[PDB]
Amino acid sequence: RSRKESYSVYVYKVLKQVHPDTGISSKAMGIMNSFVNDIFERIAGEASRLAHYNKRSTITSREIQTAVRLLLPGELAKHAVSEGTKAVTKYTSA
Amino acid sequence: RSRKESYSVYVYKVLKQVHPDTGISSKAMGIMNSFVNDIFERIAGEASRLAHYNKRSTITSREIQTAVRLLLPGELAKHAVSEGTKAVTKYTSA
Amino acid sequence: PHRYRPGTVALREIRRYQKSTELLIRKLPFQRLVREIAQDFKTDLRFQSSAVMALQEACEAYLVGLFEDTNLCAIHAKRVTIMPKDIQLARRIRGERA
Amino acid sequence: KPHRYRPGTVALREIRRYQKSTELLIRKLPFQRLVREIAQDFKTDLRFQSSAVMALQEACEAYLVGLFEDTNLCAIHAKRVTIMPKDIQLARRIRGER
Amino acid sequence: RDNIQGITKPAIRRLARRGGVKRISGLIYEETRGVLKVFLENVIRDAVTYTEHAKRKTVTAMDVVYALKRQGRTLYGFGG
Amino acid sequence: VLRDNIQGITKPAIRRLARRGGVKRISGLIYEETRGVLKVFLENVIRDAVTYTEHAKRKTVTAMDVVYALKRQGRTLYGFG
Amino acid sequence: AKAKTRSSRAGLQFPVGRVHRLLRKGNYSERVGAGAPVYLAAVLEYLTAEILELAGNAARDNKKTRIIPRHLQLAIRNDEELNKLLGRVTIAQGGVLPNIQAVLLPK
Amino acid sequence: LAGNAARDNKKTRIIPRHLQLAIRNDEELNKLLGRVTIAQGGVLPNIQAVLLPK
DNA sequence: ATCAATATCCACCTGCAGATACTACCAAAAGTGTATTTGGAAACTGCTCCATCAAAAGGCATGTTCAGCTGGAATCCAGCTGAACATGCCTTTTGATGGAGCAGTTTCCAAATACACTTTTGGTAGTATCTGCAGGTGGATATTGAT
């Protein structure tokens, strides 16, 4: 009884959102899982470093915002920052 | 007004061991501190990764040994491994 | 009899192999080479199939990138033939020799 | 009737002189003004420590020296001794910066 | 044990055609064989280190993925 | 404000930087080219540095921010901490 | 009772207790063994002694008695394994290695 | 991006080749993922101008 | 083969910034000693995937030939870069000043941890169903290359 968690169903939801009638193979889905894991580890490592530099003991939204700004370029950084900010305000105001 | 720890005195002891009558400037000592900190963080990060891969919760001597082997090349790896092993046996047998 | 001029089949092959995604080395020779190389670090190792597949993907990507760099170093000297000194320059600049 | 060195002599002498030394090769004040101008383009009303601008200077000089070495290699590859912009572009492309 | 001549000359020429090369010297084949053997032993050393640290005898795909990632050559697709 | 300071990197300074790199003969078009390169480099570091400074809610750029930026771009620097 | 420290127990010069504390506080794992700081201290001391011996030989070669960053750079760049361990670091006030291509020389 | 590539090659199902074509053809993605290898991805069709005939 | 003009190295000297050093102290830390808890080593076992043959079958590699075209060597020349001198200008050093911002001190309170409980829910395994696509076949045409 050994499981194996993955982001397959969430990637599938996003795909059905942006392309309602296109599918995806299994190897492309493995590529997408690898991509999500890689970017997650990058952002989390950078935020941990930022928290250590300032002698803080907590990872908050500002650490994630600054890590996003340090990692993504230009268009990507701007739009990701806007998306995350909107998400956090929508979450707290609910 | 808070103190600032460093490896100055230990580097000085090692120097007086290998070169009994040579001194060292202050900028070279800052270089040596930077070097020690950098190598320490490299080894410790690699050992942490190794411990996470095997779903272990403890950093032991084997993790440090494998990190040393993964980071240093050839001569350096061999001699560092021998030195650390001798140190650990000398420590436990005392 | 019909004969193409030297260089036509070359560009035809270039387009063909840049349109494709296959592997360009045979699998059994690469497997034997990998096992023989691993023979010196430890004896009696086993390999999953996906391990050798990953090794092959990585090696082919590396070599194709190196060949692009070599082609640039060749064109820089006003040639079209790649020579070993172009490979050596590309690797020296990348830092793989230095 | 006055003494003149042949072209390339003072250049080799200067090569030895500047490879034997460790000083900085850019004036401090122009570099500091340049750094402050760029920073102002990024965020207004900034301040700087002295060691920060010194670190920036050391890093930038090391970068440019390494780039010039790679450029020299690319130039010699083409059977020249004069470095030209296309060599800088080839070096920066093989390195992976453009 | 010439398993390095298993990488035939037409195979290297195919690899060169994919990289956009239009003409190939005759001394290129030995050079690429040397380069490839260097790269391969560099990767397999760390793969076998990762393996024997875990006290296993079978080299897994994840060991190769880690050995590649530590060289700065991340590889997507075999993360399972 | 201050504008047009890239010209303070004079031709003799670039010639010296090239001498330390082993370069014997220099084209006349190199200087301009070089300046561009340098500017790009600085803009990539200072930005990162400033991103650290605003994170701590500071207003002065310290040497540690520069060292962190250089390290995160793979250009580690020993001597300043 | 009488308290002898850990670095003396292991026969080292570097601090074992400080390395233990740095391994704990640095957030690397949730537990830390007893021999890990000893191993790490021994490795760090070995590397420092290696690089310092090379730098001192360089310094005594240039007829000086006190090491400066130039000597550290000359030691690092002249050894294969050190230069390949530290291939991507910049040493402030270090300079470069004297080296001119053969084709640029006269004759 | 990958779906646009897939629909461009008259297909209905994304494969790794389409992911590679999407990544390599965009500046910011190619510069974010500049050092990754996608298995079964291939390369971008591109021949130097000097190698063409005439 | 010679000579003469320039630049570099070395012996001598000295002023001074820097390394070595107590003294004090002092606060922060490392070591000892228990008690508790839990993660990891040993043992067993099941079952899955890796190594080894067997064995056609045909697609790819190898050796050979011929010829074309490319790389390299040799002249030749012009323009572009180096070397040197005169001028001036702007960087550097030293000192002083204002003062803005950083770092330490204290409060306190909003927010994150730790447990116990309950409800989904996403992931494995069959089990099943359907169909987008890779492989095969025919026919049009786009391109090359010698006349």
Author numbering:
A (entry chain h), B (entry chain d): 31 to 124
C (entry chain a): 38 to 135
D (entry chain e): 37 to 134
E (entry chain b): 23 to 102
F (entry chain f): 21 to 101
G (entry chain c): 12 to 118
H (entry chain g): 65 to 118
Please, what does the article write about this entry?
The Rpd3S complex plays a pivotal role in facilitating local histone deacetylation in the transcribed regions to suppress intragenic transcription initiation. Here, we present the cryo–electron microscopy structures of the budding yeast Rpd3S complex in both its apo and three nucleosome-bound states at atomic resolutions, revealing the exquisite architecture of Rpd3S to well accommodate a mononucleosome without linker DNA. The Rpd3S core, containing a Sin3 Lobe and two NB modules, is a rigid complex and provides three positive-charged anchors (Sin3_HCR and two Rco1_NIDs) to connect nucleosomal DNA. The Rpd3S core reveals a compact architecture composed of three modules: a Sin3 Lobe (Sin3 and Rpd3) and two modules involved in the nucleosome binding (named “NB1” and “NB2,” respectively).
To explore its natural working mechanism, we assembled the Rpd3S complex with endogenous nucleosomes and resolved the cryo–electron microscopy (cryo-EM) structures in three distinct mononucleosome-bound states. In three nucleosome-bound states, the Rpd3S core exhibits three distinct orientations relative to the nucleosome, assisting the sector-shaped deacetylase Rpd3 to locate above the SHL5-6, SHL0-1, or SHL2-3, respectively. When superposed by the Rpd3S core, the nucleosome in state 2 or state 3 undergoes a rotation of ~140° clockwise or counterclockwise from state 1, respectively. In detail, the Sin3_HCR, Rco1′_NID and Rco1_NID bind at SHL5/4/2 in state 1, respectively (left); at SHL1/5/7 in state 2, respectively (middle); and at SHL2/7/1 in state 3, respectively (right). Instead, aided by the auxiliary subunits, the Rpd3 is located above SHL5-6, SHL0-1, or SHL2-3 in state 1, 2, or 3, respectively. Upon nucleosome superposition, the deacetylases in all states are located at the same plane 30 Å away from the nucleosome, potentially engaging in a revolving motion around the vertex of the sector. However, in states 2 and 3, the corresponding distance allows to bind with several lysine residues on H3 or H4 N-terminal tails (middle and right). Upon comparing the structures in three nucleosome-bound states, the rigid core of Rpd3S takes different orientations relative to nucleosome. It suggests that the Rpd3S complex facilitates the deacetylase in achieving the precise position relative to the nucleosome, thereby enabling it function at distinct deacetylation sites.
